């Protein structure tokens, strides 16, 4: 958007998490399949 692009030019940055929100949903299935 505008704020996100504005801060990139100045020098600020945001980094992606190592574990994506898809692998997290794969851990939870393992934590939930074993319990049941």
């Amino acid at each position: 958007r505008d704020l996100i692009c504005a801060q990139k030019f100045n020098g600020l940055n945001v980094l992606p998490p190592l574990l994506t929100d898809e692998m997290i949903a794969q851990y939870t299935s393992a934590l939930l399949a074993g319990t049941i």
């Binding site: 505008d2 504005a6 030019f9 100045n10």
Partner: protein
């Protein structure tokens, strides 16, 4: 570049912003120039680091 005393460094590209006839400058939320009108020929330009 040096536009009427305002200097800077950045890439110049053809602009598409809807400037009013009397306007001369385009400023941002961080108070940094983004667009300007050439003083010799009448057009619009976009400046970006």
């Amino acid at each position: 570049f040096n536009f009427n005393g305002l200097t800077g460094t950045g890439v110049l590209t053809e602009s598409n912003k809807k400037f009013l006839p009397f306007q001369q400058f385009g400023r941002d939320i961080a108070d940094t120039t983004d667009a300007v009108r050439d003083p010799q020929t009448l057009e619009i330009l976009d400046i970006t680091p």
